[PDB]
Amino acid sequence: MPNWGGGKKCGVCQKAVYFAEEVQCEGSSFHKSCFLCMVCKKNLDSTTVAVHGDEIYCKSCYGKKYGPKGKGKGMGAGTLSTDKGESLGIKYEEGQSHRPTNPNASRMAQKVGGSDGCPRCGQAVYAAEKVIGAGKSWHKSCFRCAKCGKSLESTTLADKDGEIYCKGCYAKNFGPKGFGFGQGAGALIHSQ
Ligand SMILES: [Zn+2]
Numbered sequence: 001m002p003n004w005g006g007g008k009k010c011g012v013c014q015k016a017v018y019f020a021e022e023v024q025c026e027g028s029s030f031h032k033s034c035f036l037c038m039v040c041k042k043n044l045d046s047t048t049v050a051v052h053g054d055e056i057y058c059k060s061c062y063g064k065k066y067g068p069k070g071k072g073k074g075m076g077a078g079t080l081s082t083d084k085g086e087s088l089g090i091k092y093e094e095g096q097s098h099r100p101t102n103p104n105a106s107r108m109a110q111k112v113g114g115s116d117g118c119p120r121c122g123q124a125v126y127a128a129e130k131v132i133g134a135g136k137s138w139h140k141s142c143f144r145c146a147k148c149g150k151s152l153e154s155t156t157l158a159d160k161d162g163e164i165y166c167k168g169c170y171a172k173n174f175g176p177k178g179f180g181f182g183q184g185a186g187a188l189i190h191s192q
């Protein structure tokens with residue numbers, strides 16, 4: 001019954017150490033198992049150990065948290081632009097000409113011949129059937145007596161002041177005269 005003794009005070013777990021380990025530290029002390037890197041979670045039962053605000057950390061860890069991180073970054077830039085050149089054009093023209101007109105001249109001419117026409121039928125007369133009579137020309141076929149109708153030739157024909165007839169007509173028309181005659185009367189007797 002009578003017993004107690006002494007021990008340490010674990011300011012970590014808040015339990016009194018029954019004199020066994022009572023790990024001491026900078027103005028502090030915790031149980032052995034208690035004294036464990038609260039970072040890596042690995043027990044810390046050796047030197048090279050560090051402490052911290054109500055906590056314990058192994059050197060390394062300490063140098064890890066305390067240690068730096070690294071460097072930052074930088075930057076850059078750049079730009080450029082240019083352009084030019086443009087020109088073009090052209091033009092032209094032309095004229096024209098004309099052409100006037102010139103008048104014309106006249107000429108002369110003349111030429112005649114023989115031959116004639118048929119004043120009877122009306123057609124023309126030139127050889128083949130051309131007759132000349134009464135100082136006129138006509139078709140030897142048409143050329144006939146304008147009294148009997150009997151066709152003529154030239155001589156046998158008779159040109160009466162333009163007119164044309166047959167000798168028989170030219171003669172008769174202008175025939176000679178003839179003597180006349182009469183009758184007498186004998187005598188007889190009567191009886192019964
Ligand atoms: Zn403890």
Ligand SMILES: [Zn+2]
Nearest residue numbers: 037040058061
């Ligand atoms: Zn650690």
Ligand SMILES: [Zn+2]
Nearest residue numbers: 118121139142
């Ligand atoms: Zn004729």
Ligand SMILES: [Zn+2]
Nearest residue numbers: 145148166169
């Ligand atoms: Zn006749």
